[PDB]
Motif scaffolding. Structure first.
Motif, PDB file in Angstrom:
ATOM      1  N   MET A 125      -0.774  11.356  -3.522  1.00 16.49           N
ATOM      2  CA  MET A 125      -1.336  10.059  -3.140  1.00 16.49           C
ATOM      3  C   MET A 125      -0.475   9.299  -2.132  1.00 16.49           C
ATOM      4  SD  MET A 125      -4.224   9.969  -4.551  1.00 16.49           S
ATOM      5  CE  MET A 125      -4.556   8.302  -3.994  1.00 16.49           C
ATOM      6  N   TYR A 173       0.828  -1.203   0.000  1.00 15.71           N
ATOM      7  CA  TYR A 173       0.000   0.000   0.000  1.00 15.71           C
ATOM      8  C   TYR A 173       0.863   1.254   0.000  1.00 15.71           C
ATOM      9  CZ  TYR A 173      -4.875  -1.513   0.481  1.00 15.71           C
ATOM     10  OH  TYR A 173      -6.141  -1.994   0.248  1.00 15.71           O
ATOM     11  N   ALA A 230       2.993   1.510  -3.574  1.00 17.59           N
ATOM     12  CA  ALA A 230       2.187   1.833  -4.746  1.00 17.59           C
ATOM     13  C   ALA A 230       1.882   3.321  -4.825  1.00 17.59           C
ATOM     14  CB  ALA A 230       0.891   1.024  -4.732  1.00 17.59           C
TER      15      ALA A 230
END
Ligand SMILES: CCCCCCCCCCCCCCCCCC(=O)OC[C@H](COP(=O)([O-])OCC(O)COP(=O)([O-])OC[C@@H](COC(=O)CCCCCCCCCCCCCCCCC)OC(=O)CCCCCCCCCCCCCCCCC)OC(=O)CCCCCCCCCCCCCCCCC
Ligand SMILES: CCCCCCCCCCCCCCCCCC(=O)OC[C@H](COP(=O)([O-])OCC(O)COP(=O)([O-])OC[C@@H](COC(=O)CCCCCCCCCCCCCCCCC)OC(=O)CCCCCCCCCCCCCCCCC)OC(=O)CCCCCCCCCCCCCCCCC
Ligand SMILES: CCCCCCCCCCCCCCCCCC(=O)OC[C@H](COP(=O)([O-])OCC(O)COP(=O)([O-])OC[C@@H](COC(=O)CCCCCCCCCCCCCCCCC)OC(=O)CCCCCCCCCCCCCCCCC)OC(=O)CCCCCCCCCCCCCCCCC
Ligand SMILES: CCCCCCCCCCCCCCCCC[C@@H](O)O[C@H](CO[C@H](O)CCCCCCCCCCCCCCC)COP(=O)(O)OCC[N+](C)(C)C
Ligand SMILES: CCCCCCCC/C=C/CCCCCCCC(=O)OC[C@H](COP(=O)(O)OCCN)OC(=O)CCCCCCC/C=C/CCCCCCCC
Ligand SMILES: CCCCCCCC/C=C\CCCCCCCC(=O)OC[C@H](COP(=O)(O)OCCN)OC(=O)CCCCCCC/C=C\CCCCCCCC
Ligand SMILES: CCCCCCCC/C=C\CCCCCCCC(=O)O[C@H](COC(=O)CCCCCCC/C=C/CCCCCCCC)COP(=O)(O)OCCN
Lengths: 156, 178, 459, 606, 128
Positions: C201, C152, C155
């Motif tokens: 992100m 997680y 990425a």
């Protein structure tokens, strides 16, 4: 010491699978009925009656008195919702859907009457209160450089 | 609370329980003692009207009708004894109940106080340890092969035997432990 | 800044040269000394930051985080030594080495002047945490939890690396001072939109943002006590710090690129607060509460106001301390009864009164009772959101109500009622556990007297 | 320096000394409760002096002694407002707390944690003082949450009882529902007026918009337990009787009314919020009075009386009479605390029994308690020249002579009837008739603590109305000219309530039995509000929290989309790529295909 | 005769009003006996460990472990993508997000367009 086959599994379809599941949860095969086999993920867990812990017998000698549960018995899927510190399903003296009508009617009647009373207020047969200095123009914010319109009161 | 429950309630037991519930709710409705006594004798008469019925079907139907009448006419706020499951003092003293095994974790300075009490506790612990095996053996002897059928436990039957599974019944903390 | 880094490095040979029975004492003493030394960074200049050299600098945002990390290390050591008593000397030294390496990477991460060094250290923090979780975790799900936690993060982080090298190529520098002084607006284009996403992100998933938060319950529940402490207290704040550093160059695009993230954060804080109401595991409830608090922090960062950043900094510090205390409180009971189920052990107030007091204080700080710094940050964020839009108050109030609900639910379930009868191995609280709770809670209350130390640069 | 500020701050400061000594040796002895009681009495007698200074010269002050933090243009400072409200409410609260702790020394004698009980009472008193004396909204919020948390801790005093924990959590839930509006008001005031302090807010809000006032109204409704958020106050009776007498009767539950009084300059500039407050107060007082007349538990009846009086305070706020509302708070404190004290003495005498159906003839068995309860009931019903007269009858007079909602006026009058109704119910069922308690009589009220405390509150309930009414400046324009029938409306209503309630109570002696009417079932079960609102929304919320938020989204779909899809796709691709038969024929055929492609799709493009 | 009481979800049917307990057959009695025997055997198994002087610790309960495992770990392995499941998931997942986006976007667009007109009354608003 809880081995692999003592854990919940998939939905049972064969009668022997249902018997094995009923034995695993310490239940009678006639009493054990799982949740409907949709994709919600309930699997093998039995669908116990939706009664609360408050409805259980308080005079029984439970293993956990506050919880009103017995050691080794199947536990409802929603036990933490029914812990009797929370949602209670106990029968009421007055039927549900009868209390709802009375409560809703009382609130609606009071609201409608308050609106009506707002339309038709109560007051005394008197004139508006009269104040000396142009309705206290300088007192209620001032701006003493714009010559307020003369508010003149006469005796009667 | 103290008696092992049965698999089901007989018609007689249900009838007596309905009688007691009706009497208690009538007392809740009839606050004063004389009026309560009058209406309780009336209830007793109406209850004895069908005392000697032999047809079980009509007796069951009478019981169902009486239960419906009780539910419709019950008191929404019946009187409850303070220590009863609905009373205002039901579980008031549960926070004062400390299990007896906590006394083993006491500091030796804490046990320097109260020496005779802890000597007698040592006596009780020796008694329990010397009786446990006989309790287990007796329970194994007096039990059907297909497991126990009820929650009843047998008494002691030998000279120096204690009733099996007695430690946690005898050593209850108290009803007013503090 | 070397006066902090070098003793932290010296912690390694010192613990590798210690006797088998002195490692905990030596590590705790010198970690406390290092925390005392690091406490001197709170003296901030106001106008600008403290620029020690070309490589490191200190800010009013970085200093509370550095002090929190340095203070958290000794608490981690105190919490770890109970469940590691049966371990060999070499493996205990390796565990302490992992903790020291994590501290070093964290203290270097918060002070780097340049974004590639920040990225390198911010990724380097992964390895010790992964090793701790997958080697000293208790259950068999620790492997899956570690895989989730690693992938997680990566990425999201790799596009950040690509965006950073592209930005350095286009601008010529990534030094934060040059980045701030030579800031130019981001136009409205697809290339700029994807640059914004690549810059955002990674910090989103480190918070975590709702919808990208699935790794957090696994990792925080399956890790040992020290791992959970460092995950909740410090490692969650890396995303917030990165956002505060990186949004300087993202204007004016953030004006509308933040809408989905604001929506996700508000509704997901509601969702996670609701989730906490139906949880059978005690650690998962604390993890989800952390998710809700970090969602509120995400909203505060996204709205880009001075009050929002001040509230976000205060909330980060307060949440770190409170979550660490709550994890330690859960771990004490787990060590007693060897199970994480909340309803297994009940009525612990009858058996452990002082631990019940610690539980009550931790629950009160979790629900942000005034005038604690938790409510200071939360109220500042709520006011900033109200300025952003008056309709946010509905969601803020709903979240407050649900937070109080599950906090007191956890307290009542674990501490009140009657004790479980068959559980008879609950020993009196040790001095170590009470001292650990006190060392968690006392700085929280002391920070109330001087709130400006944790309000950040916008103060 | 002016002694006013020093004395006002010392009164608040000395209350914290026993909290500091809670870790000392005196906390381990049995002298701690007496020490705390003596400290509170000294605080009261010290607070008496600034009240005298105000009554002489009208001295008011604000003290910004300590600067906490400054955010840009906004300064946050520890500031105390020492106006008429503070200097009048502090001595009354200290007097009531002194009496109630002297009562607790007897009532809670056998409790093994009496020291913790007195410490909790002192903490509540400190938090209430902080709430009352606050000059800015942050300090008032601190006091708000402090009294809320202390109420939570004191309701669940017997933490081994499930119902106590449930009631404490219910109170917390309702108070946070109100706290939503409190926070909304704070945010609006900071955003639009750039201040949290009272002085700046008054100056910058000549025409106050609806949002902050509706937030304040929501907060007040939450704290004062109005019709929307009422049920937690009756359920707060799970705590010990002194807690009900102090926190949930006279001192803490008036916090919402006090908050609305603190902002009356803004409230008087808006008529919509005034109308909303008036209507909410009217519905609250009448609903609670209707619920009271059918209850069998004495503490529940007195709690519903408290809720009805709070609704009366709300209606007198709604007609723009804040000083009258404050006077009502101060007057009602005395006799409501006395009523709970008498109920507690009765409960302790009859072996912890609270149902009035088992309370027989105590008019002779408990003479002093009977006298005190009768005096308190006469004060509650507005008997002339008592404590309740000087405020309640003026409130009725002002409600009658105002441009007000007709329905609110009618509901206020009906609530005035119901007040005498349930007072008559309490007296008739608890003190008259024949005994109905178990035969072993333990009745004994011969304890100096109980007698002295009830005596002090009795003297208060007799003379405080006259003394305070005559010792304050006129802050409301009197209603001097009104019709005679309209002057006597309150007394006519009270006498009608007395007569009809007494008639219906006398009719239960008859040897006649009838099933209850539907209206009786509605009244006794509290309008079915706790039957539905405590079951439907809670069930739906918890069911959606488990089925949808936890299971459907986090455990199923969020798992399905990002991680499980990735795992499945990579597993399928790995199986496709790595499952080769190891035959060079196929590999070299693929090599030929690749060569043919590179020479055509790439080698022709340059 | 008297008005009837009808049960619901949150107010269930009392036992004394249940026709099932008044229509009894021998198989019902056998079922009750079987249930009582199961309960008694579980009670004996628990009480043999509860009263053991030798035993120290927490007596593990298989039923609690089954409940926790079913509520946490067994859910995904028993999940199927179904029109009911898909529709409920889509609704409860993305409906509220778009609803709140619409509400906030409309409010902020109104506020910004009203700012551009020069009519918001932002006097004294120096803190944000
Ligand atoms: C406000 C009063 C002012 C008093 C002045 C002096 C206060 C000194 C206290 C210092 C801080 C306390 C330390 C907390 C750790 C617990 C200690 C412990 O283990 O007890 C052992 C000790 C030994 O007892 P024991 O017989 O062996 O057995 C104890 C059992 O375990 C079980 O015993 P227990 O059941 O009694 O539990 C112990 C106790 C302790 O547990 C606690 O929870 C106490 C901590 C309060 C809550 C903490 C989080 C909430 C956020 C508030 C943050 C405030 C920080 C301010 C700066 C603090 C500086 C460190 O719990 C409680 O009493 C109930 C808690 C409810 C508190 C509600 C207060 C809300 C806000 C009030 C105002 C706060 C701002 C002040 C200024 C406002 C504007 C003027 O017990 C005590 O001494 C009791 C502690 C005294 C109670 C303090 C409550 C209020 C103080 C708040 C902070 C002080 C502010 C000072 C500024 C000036 C005013
Ligand atoms: C010139 C101006 C001067 C005016 C002077 C007076 C004016 C006329 C006054 C007459 C008005 C009320 C008179 C008394 C009422 C009850 C007397 C009676 O007959 O007893 C038998 C019976 C009592 O039940 P039970 O079976 O005998 O009790 C079983 C055992 O005895 C259980 O025994 P227990 O041991 O449990 O305890 C017994 C207990 C419990 O007894 C009860 O169960 C009674 C509880 C309810 C009745 C209480 C009356 C309060 C009504 C307020 C309603 C406001 C509007 C709410 C709208 C709701 C909308 C659904 O009784 C008490 O201790 C005290 C009860 C009340 C005594 C004080 C009542 C006086 C205040 C009301 C009149 C105000 C006077 C001054 C006027 C001010 C303005 C001019 O009463 C009834 O069956 C009916 C009651 C009538 C209530 C009507 C509510 C009004 C609004 C209706 C809806 C309107 C809209 C249309 C429908 C919607 C369409 C969409
Ligand atoms: C961060 C917060 C959280 C976010 C994440 C969480 C939430 C998001 C992720 C999770 C939720 C999304 C799940 C997506 C759907 C996954 C379906 C699936 O995996 O199937 C495998 C699964 C396994 O395949 P299999 O084993 O080979 O098939 C055997 C079947 O079990 C045997 O079944 P059968 O033969 O009995 O039935 C099959 C048959 C019959 O199906 C049925 O009987 C039920 C009817 C299904 C289709 C039509 C829906 C009917 C009810 C609602 C109609 C629309 C109402 C209005 C919607 C907008 C309202 C404003 O299928 C159809 O006839 C469907 C024809 C299509 C007509 C309508 C197409 C509408 C497209 C979407 C419109 C709504 C857009 C969103 C609007 C949002 C506005 C803000 O197939 C199924 O069992 C499900 C089939 C039904 C799927 C319906 C999907 C409806 C949900 C909305 C989809 C749009 C969202 C996805 C976006 C990307 C779409 C390209
Ligand atoms: C579970 C949580 C995961 C994390 C969530 C991350 C959220 C990412 C979403 C990004 C926010 C918005 C992205 C871009 C902003 C606007 C997008 C577009 O819809 O707006 C219109 C764009 O028009 C069209 O809509 C083009 C986009 C259509 C194609 C995109 C496919 C969207 C379908 C949803 C797929 C799900 C994506 C996330 C996968 C997980 C605006 O019209 P226009 O003014 O002319 O274009 C402006 C751009 N200019 C200036 C360069 C010209
Ligand atoms: C504005 C934002 C908030 C608005 C309200 C939204 C709905 C709130 C939903 C809250 C759900 C929380 C559920 C989790 C709680 C745990 C379970 C629980 O609490 O159990 C219920 C527990 C036990 O029930 P008892 O009857 O007391 O039991 C005694 C004998 N056994 O009681 C409760 O605490 C339930 C409380 C539920 C409150 C919900 C109703 C509130 C509605 C308010 C609307 C009115 C607004 C006021 C208007 C004021 C005028 C401006
Ligand atoms: C007790 C034993 C001590 C007795 C001997 C002392 C005799 C008098 C000495 C006075 C002290 C000297 C002095 O007042 O100097 C000022 C000195 C510092 O200057 P300030 O600006 O006022 O505050 C710092 C931030 N600006 O003030 C002080 O700190 C001393 C007085 C502080 C009062 C105590 C604080 C009470 C509140 C406790 C904290 C509550 C949380 C915050 C709530 C915020 C509410 C909006
Ligand atoms: C674990 C979950 C976390 C997932 C996070 C993943 C999202 C990361 C954000 C997007 C990643 C790619 C960003 C690329 C790096 C930015 C550099 C840049 O700005 O260059 C752009 C290049 O822009 C692109 O090429 C972007 C195209 C996308 C490539 C890969 C697409 C994969 C899917 C993208 C959408 C998903 C991203 C957000 C989803 C978040 C997670 C759900 C413009 O350069 P020029 O060519 O010079 O143009 C100007 C001169 N003509």
């Amino acid at each position: 010491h809880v081995t692999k086959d003592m854990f919940p599994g998939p939905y049972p379809k064969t009668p022997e699978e249902r018997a094995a599941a009923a034995k695993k949860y310490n239940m009678r095969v006639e009493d054990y009925e799982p949740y409907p086999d949709d994709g919600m993920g309930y699997g093998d867990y039995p669908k116990l009656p939706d009664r609360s812990q408050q409805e259980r017998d308080p005079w029984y000698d439970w293993d956990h008195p506050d919880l009103r549960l017995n050691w080794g018995e199947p536990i409802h899927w929603d036990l933490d919702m029914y812990i009797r510190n929370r949602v209670d399903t106990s029968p009421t003296p007055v039927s549900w859907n009868t209390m709802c009508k009375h409560l809703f009617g009382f609130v609606a009647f009071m609201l409608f009457m308050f609106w009506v009373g707002e339309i038709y207020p109560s007051y005394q047969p008197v004139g508006p209160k009269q104040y000396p200095y142009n309705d206290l123009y300088l007192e209620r914010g001032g701006d003493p450089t714009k010559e307020p319109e003369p508010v003149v009161h006469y005796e009667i | 609370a103290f008696s092992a429950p049965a698999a089901y309630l007989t018609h007689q037991q249900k009838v007596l329980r309905l009688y007691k519930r009706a009497l208690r709710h009538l007392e809740s409705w009839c606050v004063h003692r004389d009026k309560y006594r009058y209406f309780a004798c009336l209830m007793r008469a109406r209850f004895d009207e069908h005392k000697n019925e032999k047809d079980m079907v009509k007796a069951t139907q009478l019981l169902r009708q009486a239960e419906e009448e009780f539910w419709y006419g019950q008191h929404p706020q019946p009187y409850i004894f303070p220590e009863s499951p609905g009373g205002t003092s039901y579980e008031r003293y549960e926070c004062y109940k400390v299990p007896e095994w906590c006394l083993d974790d006491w500091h030796p300075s804490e046990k320097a106080m109260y020496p005779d009490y802890f000597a007698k506790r040592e006596q009780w612990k020796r008694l329990r340890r010397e009786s446990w095996e006989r309790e287990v053996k007796q329970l194994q002897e007096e039990t059907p092969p297909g497991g126990p059928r009820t929650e009843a436990l047998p008494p002691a039957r030998k000279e120096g035997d204690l009733p099996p599974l007695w430690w946690h019944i005898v050593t209850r903390p108290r009803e007013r432990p503090m | 800044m070397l006066k902090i880094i070098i003793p932290t490095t010296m912690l390694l040979p010192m613990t590798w040269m210690s006797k088998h029975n002195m490692i905990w004492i030596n590590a705790t003493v010198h970690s406390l000394l290092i925390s005392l030394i690091s406490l001197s960074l709170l003296n901030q200049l106001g106008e600008n930051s403290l620029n020690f050299s070309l490589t490191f600098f200190s800010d009013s945002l970085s200093a509370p985080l550095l002090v929190l990390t340095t203070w958290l290390l000794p608490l981690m050591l105190m919490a770890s030594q109970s469940h590691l008593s049966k371990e060999t000397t070499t493996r205990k030294k390796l565990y302490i080495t992992m903790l020291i390496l994590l501290q070093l990477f964290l203290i270097m991460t918060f002070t780097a002047t340049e974004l590639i060094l920040f990225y390198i250290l911010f990724e380097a923090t992964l390895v010790p945490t992964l090793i701790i979780i997958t080697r000293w975790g208790n259950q068999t799900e620790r492997l899956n939890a570690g895989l989730y936690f690693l992938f997680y993060t990566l990425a999201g982080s790799l596009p950040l690396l690509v965006a950073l090298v592209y930005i350095q190529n286009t601008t010529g520098s990534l030094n934060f001072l040059i980045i701030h002084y030579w800031s130019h607006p981001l136009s409205n284009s697809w290339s700029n939109i994807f640059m914004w996403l690549a810059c955002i992100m990674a910090f989103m998933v480190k918070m975590p943002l709702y919808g990208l938060h699935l790794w957090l319950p696994k990792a925080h529940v399956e890790a040992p006590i020290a791992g959970s402490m460092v995950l909740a207290a410090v490692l969650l704040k890396l995303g917030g710090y990165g956002m505060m550093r990186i949004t300087t160059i993202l204007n004016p695009l953030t004006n509308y690129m933040a809408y989905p993230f604001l929506m996700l954060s508000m509704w997901g804080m509601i969702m996670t607060s609701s989730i906490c109401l139906r949880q059978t595991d005690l650690k998962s409830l604390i993890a989800y509460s952390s998710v809700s608090h970090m969602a509120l922090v995400i909203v505060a960062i996204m709205i880009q106001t001075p009050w929002s950043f001040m509230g976000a900094t205060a909330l980060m510090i307060a949440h770190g301390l409170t979550s660490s205390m709550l994890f330690c409180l859960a771990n004490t009971n787990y060590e007693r009864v060897h199970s994480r189920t909340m309803i297994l052990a009940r009525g612990l107030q009858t058996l452990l009164p002082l631990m019940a007091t610690w539980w009550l204080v931790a629950s009160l700080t979790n629900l942000a009772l005034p005038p604690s710094i938790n409510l200071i940050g939360e109220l500042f964020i709520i006011t900033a959101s109200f300025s952003w839009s008056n309709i946010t108050i509905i969601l803020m109030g709903m979240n407050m109500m649900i937070t109080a609900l599950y906090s007191l639910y956890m307290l009542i379930t674990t501490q009140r009622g009657k004790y479980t009868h068959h559980i008879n191995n609950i020993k009196p609280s040790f001095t170590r556990e009470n001292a650990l709770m006190a060392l968690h809670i006392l700085p929280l209350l002391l920070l109330t007297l001087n709130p400006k130390m944790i309000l950040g640069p916008l103060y | 320096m002016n002694p006013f500020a020093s004395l006002t701050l010392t009164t608040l400061t000395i209350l914290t000394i026993p909290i500091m000594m809670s870790n000392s040796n005196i906390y381990k002895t049995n002298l701690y409760p007496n020490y705390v009681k003596t400290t509170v009495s000294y605080a009261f007698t010290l607070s008496l002096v600034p009240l005298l200074m105000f009554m002489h010269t009208g001295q008011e002050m604000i003290i910004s002694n300590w600067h906490w933090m400054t955010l840009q243009t906004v300064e946050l400072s520890l500031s105390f407002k020492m106006d008429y409200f503070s200097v009048m409410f502090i001595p009354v609260a200290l007097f009531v707390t002194w009496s109630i702790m002297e009562f607790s020394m007897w009532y809670m004698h056998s409790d093994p944690f009496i020291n913790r009980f007195f410490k909790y009472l002192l903490l509540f008193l400190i938090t209430m003082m902080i709430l009352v004396t606050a000059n800015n909204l942050f300090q008032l919020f601190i006091g708000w949450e402090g009294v809320g948390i202390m109420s939570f801790l004191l309701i669940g005093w017997w933490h081994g009882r499930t119902d106590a924990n449930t009631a404490a959590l219910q109170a917390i839930l309702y108070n946070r529902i109100g706290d939503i509006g409190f926070v909304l008001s704070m945010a609006w005031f900071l955003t639009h007026s750039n201040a949290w302090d009272l002085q700046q807010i008054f100056m910058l809000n000549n025409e106050c918009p609806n949002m902050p006032l509706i937030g304040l109204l929501l907060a007040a409704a939450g704290k004062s337990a109005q019709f929307g958020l009422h049920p937690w106050l009756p359920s707060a009776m799970e705590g010990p009787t002194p807690v009900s007498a102090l926190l949930h009767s006279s001192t803490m539950v008036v916090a919402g009314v006090f908050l609305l009084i603190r902002f009356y300059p803004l409230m008087e500039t808006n008529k919509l919020v005034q109308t909303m407050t008036l209507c909410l107060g009217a519905i609250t007082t009448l609903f609670t009075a209707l619920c009271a007349i059918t209850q069998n538990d004495i503490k529940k009846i007195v709690a519903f009386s408290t809720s009805s009086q709070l609704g009366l305070m709300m209606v007198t706020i709604g007609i723009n009479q804040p000083h009258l509302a404050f006077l009502h708070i101060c007057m009602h404190a005395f006799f409501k605390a006395m009523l709970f004290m008498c109920s507690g003495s009765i409960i302790h005498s009859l072996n912890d029994e609270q149902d009035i159906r088992k309370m027989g003839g105590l008019y002779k068995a408990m003479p002093f308690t009977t006298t005190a309860l009768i005096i308190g009931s006469l004060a509650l019903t507005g008997m002339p020249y008592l404590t309740g007269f000087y405020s309640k009858d003026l409130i009725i007079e002002a409600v009658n002579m105002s441009y007000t909602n007709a329905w609110a006026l009618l509901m206020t009058l009906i609530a005035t009837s119901l007040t005498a109704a349930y007072s008559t119910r309490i007296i008739f069922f608890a003190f008259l008739g024949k005994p109905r308690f178990p035969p072993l009589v333990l009745i004994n009220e011969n304890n100096p603590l109980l007698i002295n405390s009830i005596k002090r509150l009795l003297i208060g309930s007799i003379f405080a109305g006259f003394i305070i009414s005559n010792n304050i400046p006129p802050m409301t324009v009197p209603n001097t000219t009104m019709p005679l029938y309209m002057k006597m409306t309150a007394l006519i209503v009270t006498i009608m309530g007395f007569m009809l309630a007494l008639e219906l109570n006398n009719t239960t002696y008859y040897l006649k039995f009838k099933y209850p009417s539907q209206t009786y079932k509605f009244s006794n079960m509290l309008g079915y509000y706790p039957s539905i609102m405590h079951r439907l929304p809670t069930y739906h919320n918890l069911s959606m929290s488990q089925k949808s938020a936890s299971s459907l989204l986090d455990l199923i779909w969020l798992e399905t989309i990002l991680p499980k899809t990735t795992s499945f796709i990579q597993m399928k691709m790995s199986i496709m790529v790595s499952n080769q038969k190891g035959l060079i024929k196929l590999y070299f055929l693929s090599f030929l295909i690749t060569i043919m492609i590179s020479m055509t799709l790439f080698n022709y493009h340059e | 005769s008297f008005p009837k009481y009808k049960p619901s979800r949150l107010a269930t049917l009392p036992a004394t009003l249940d026709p099932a307990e008044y229509d009894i057959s021998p198989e019902t009695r056998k079922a009750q006996a079987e249930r009582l025997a199961i309960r008694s055997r579980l009670k004996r198994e628990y009480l043999l460990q509860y009263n053991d002087p030798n035993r120290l610790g927490v007596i593990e309960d298989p039923a609690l472990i089954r409940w926790t495992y079913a509520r946490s770990a067994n859910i995904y392995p028993n999940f199927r993508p179904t029109p009911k499941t898909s529709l409920l998931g889509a609704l409860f997942g993305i409906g509220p997000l778009f609803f709140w986006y619409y509400v906030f976007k409309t409010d902020r667009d109104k506020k910004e367009k009203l700012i551009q007109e020069g009519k918001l009354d932002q006097t004294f608003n120096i803190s944000y």
